[PDB]
C-alpha cells in the first residue's frame, strides 16, 4: 500500500468522498516526494558501502564472528549480509511509499518465527539495524534520515 | 531508559569516559527539561478533556460508534477511552524521559498482535492518535507540541 492508497482506502470504507483533510494528506505527500525520491536515489547509490560500514560498526571483531558465534561460518556471514541488504532495501521501499505496510506484509510477517527457529540472535540484529540507521542518516542528511530511521526503527521494533 | 541513561549506556558499552559530545547531550537535556516539566504538568491537568475532544474530532458520529462498528458496545467504548488514555499517558512519560524506549518496552511490544486478534481497526486508531496529537499541540503550544507529537507519531508509526 501507499500513503495515497491508504488515504483512498480510508475514504473508501466510509463511502466518503475526498474531503479536505484527505486532500491535505495527499498534498503533504506530494510536497515530501521530492526529498523522498532524492533520498531513495542516493541510498540506491551505495547500499553495499552502508552494509559494510554497519557490520564494521556493530558486528565485526565481536564474538559473533568468532567460532561459536552465529556469523562464524562463511555461508552465515553471507546470509547476514543478505539479511541486512533486505532490511535496507525494504526500508527504502517503505520510505518511498510513505507507508510501512510493505514492511508488515513482506518482511515482518513471519520473521521472529524464522529467527527463533534458526537460533539467530535478535539483539545483535537490532543493533545492526541501528547501525544501518545511523550510517544512512549520516549519508542522506537529517531531513530524510528521520524518515529512513522511522521505518528502520519500525523493523527493529517489530523484530523485538 | 532515559536520555541520560541512554547517553551513559552508549558511553559505557565502549568503556569510554564521558567525552564532550555526551556532555553536550546531557546539557541539552538539562536545558530542555524546563519546558518538558511544564508540558507534562499541563498535560496531566486535563487528559480527560483531551481524550474527549479527540474522540469528538475523529471517532464520533462515524460508523464506528454505529452498530456493526467496533465501538458500538458500551464496554468497547470504555475500552476505547482506556486505550487513548494509555497512549496519552505513555506519550507523556516518553516526553519527560526524552527517550522513546518506554514506548517500545511497555506499549508497542505486542500491540499489533492484540489489535489484529481482537479485530480492532488500526487506521481509526492511527487517526485517533493523530487527533490526540493535534489537540495537545494546540493545548501545550508549538514548542512542546513538537516533542509531544514526536512520541505520538512514534506510537502511530509503530502501530501501522
Amino acid at each position: 500500500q501507499d500513503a495515497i492508497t491508504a488515504v483512498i482506502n480510508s475514504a473508501d470504507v466510509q463511502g466518503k468522498y475526498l474531503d479536505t483533510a484527505a486532500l491535505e494528506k495527499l498534498k503533504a505527500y506530494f510536497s515530501t516526494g521530492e526529498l523522498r525520491v532524492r533520498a531513495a536515489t542516493t541510498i540506491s547509490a551505495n547500499a553495499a558501502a552502508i552494509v559494510k560500514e554497519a557490520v564494521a560498526k556493530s558486528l565485526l571483531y565481536s564474538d559473533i564472528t568468532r567460532p561459536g558465534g552465529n556469523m562464524y561460518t562463511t555461508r552465515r556471514y553471507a546470509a547476514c549480509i543478505r539479511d541486512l541488504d533486505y532490511y535496507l532495501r525494504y526500508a527504502t521501499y517503505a520510505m518511498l511509499a510513505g507507508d510501512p505496510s510493505i514492511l508488515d506484509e513482506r518482511v515482518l510477517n513471519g520473521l521472529k518465527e524464522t529467527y527463533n527457529s534458526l537460533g539467530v540472535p535478535v539483539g545483535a540484529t537490532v543493533q545492526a539495524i541501528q547501525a544501518i540507521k545511523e550510517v544512512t542518516a549520516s549519508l542522506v542528511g537529517a531531513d530524510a534520515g528521520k524518515e529512513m530511521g522511522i521505518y528502520l526503527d519500525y523493523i527493529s521494533s517489530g523484530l523485538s | 531508559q532515559d536520555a541520560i541513561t541512554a547517553v551513559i549506556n552508549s558511553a559505557d558499552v565502549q568503556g569510554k569516559y564521558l567525552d564532550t559530545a555526551a556532555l553536550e547531550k546531557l546539557k541539552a537535556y538539562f536545558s530542555t527539561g524546563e519546558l518538558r516539566v511544564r508540558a507534562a504538568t499541563t498535560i496531566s491537568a486535563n487528559a480527560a478533556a483531551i481524550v474527549k475532544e479527540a474522540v469528538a474530532k475523529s471517532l464520533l458520529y462515524s460508523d464506528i460508534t454505529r452498530p456493526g462498528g467496533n465501538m458500538y458496545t458500551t464496554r468497547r467504548y470504555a475500552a476505547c477511552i482506556r486505550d487513548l488514555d494509555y497512549y496519552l499517558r505513555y506519550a507523556t512519560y516518553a516526553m519527560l524521559a526524552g527517550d522513546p524506549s518506554i514506548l517500545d518496552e511497555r506499549v508497542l511490544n505486542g500491540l499489533k498482535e492484540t489489535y489484529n486478534s481482537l479485530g480492532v481497526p488500526v487506521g481509526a486508531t492511527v487517526q485517533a492518535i493523530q487527533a490526540i496529537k493535534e489537540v495537545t499541540a494546540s493545548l501545550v503550544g508549538a514548542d512542546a507540541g513538537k516533542e509531544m507529537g514526536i512520541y505520538l507519531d512514534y506510537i502511530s508509526s509503530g502501530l501501522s
Partner: protein, 249 residues
C-alpha cells in the same frame, strides 16, 4: 423597462360590484379618512390603523414607529397614500418582511397589506416578481401605489383595508410575515425540541438516516432523470420472413 406579461386573473370576491352603501354589514372595516379630522382621537386612530395594516398590530411597538412621518400626518403636509409609502419603503419594514420573505412571497404579502387583496393565482405572483428584481423593492412598492386599482378603490386619502371579505379569514392573521420554507432561518425551530420530535419520524429524516449505498438515496435523482424507453414493436414475429431477411454482401 419591459411591459408586464399577461396573467390570468382568478375570480375573487372584490371583482364584483357589491352595490349600495346602507346594506353592507358591520364587519366591513372603518374606512378612516384624513379628511374627517374633528378631534385628535380620529387623528391617532388613523395613524394607529395605518400601522395596523403595515405591521400586523404586534410590531408597531415603539421603535418601529417612524415618529416624523406621524409628525407630518397631523400637519397634513403628506397624504395618507404618501404616508403608506413612508411606512412601506422603510428599512424598519425591510428587516421585518422584505429581507425575510421571498420575491414570490413578497408579492403575496404586500398586496394583502397595501392593496388589501390576495393575489389571484401564482401567475400574478410570478408576474410582479420580475418587477421587484430590476426596479428594486421600493420601485415595486411605488408601482403598487401608483397603480390604478389602488387609486380607484382607496383613493388618495383613505387607509387600506380588506375589500369584501364576506366569508374569509383576516389577512394579517392568515399570513404571517414569513412562511414555512424560510421558517428555519428567521425562526427557532432548530433549537426548540418540540419540533425535532415531529421531524424525527418525518420521511425526510429516513432519507438522511440511511448509510452510504442504497438506491433510495438516489430515488429523488431517479424521478428527475425521466427518459422512459419505447415499447416493443407491434409487428408480429410471423411477418419477419427470416429466410429472405438476410442481405448478401
Amino acid at each position: 423597462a419591459l411591459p408586464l406579461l399577461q396573467y390570468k386573473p382568478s375570480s375573487q370576491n372584490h371583482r364584483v360590484t357589491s352595490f349600495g352603501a346602507a346594506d353592507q354589514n358591520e364587519d366591513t372595516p372603518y374606512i378612516y379618512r384624513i379628511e374627517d379630522v374633528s378631534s385628535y382621537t380620529d387623528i391617532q386612530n388613523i395613524i394607529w390603523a395605518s400601522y395596523r395594516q403595515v405591521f400586523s398590530e404586534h410590531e408597531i411597538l415603539k421603535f418601529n414607529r417612524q415618529k416624523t412621518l406621524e409628525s407630518q400626518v397631523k400637519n397634513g403636509s403628506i397624504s395618507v397614500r404618501d404616508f403608506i409609502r413612508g411606512l412601506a419603503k422603510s428599512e424598519a419594514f425591510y428587516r421585518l418582511v422584505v429581507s425575510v420573505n421571498n420575491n414570490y412571497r413578497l408579492v403575496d404579502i404586500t398586496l394583502k397589506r397595501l392593496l388589501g387583496r390576495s393575489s389571484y393565482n401564482k401567475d400574478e405572483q410570478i408576474a410582479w416578481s420580475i418587477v421587484i428584481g430590476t426596479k428594486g423593492f421600493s420601485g415595486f412598492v411605488d408601482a403598487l401605489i401608483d397603480s390604478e386599482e389602488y387609486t380607484k378603490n382607496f383613493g388618495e386619502n383613505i387607509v387600506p383595508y380588506q375589500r369584501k371579505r364576506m366569508e374569509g379569514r383576516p389577512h394579517n392573521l392568515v399570513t404571517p410575515r414569513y412562511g414555512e420554507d424560510f421558517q428555519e432561518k428567521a425562526g427557532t425551530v432548530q433549537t426548540d425540541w418540540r419540533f425535532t420530535l415531529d421531524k424525527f419520524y418525518s420521511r425526510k429524516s429516513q432519507e438522511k438516516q440511511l448509510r452510504e449505498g442504497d438506491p433510495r438515496k438516489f430515488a429523488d435523482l431517479a424521478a428527475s432523470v425521466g427518459n422512459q424507453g419505447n415499447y416493443a414493436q407491434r409487428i408480429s414475429a410471423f411477418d419477419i420472413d427470416y429466410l429472405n431477411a438476410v442481405p448478401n454482401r
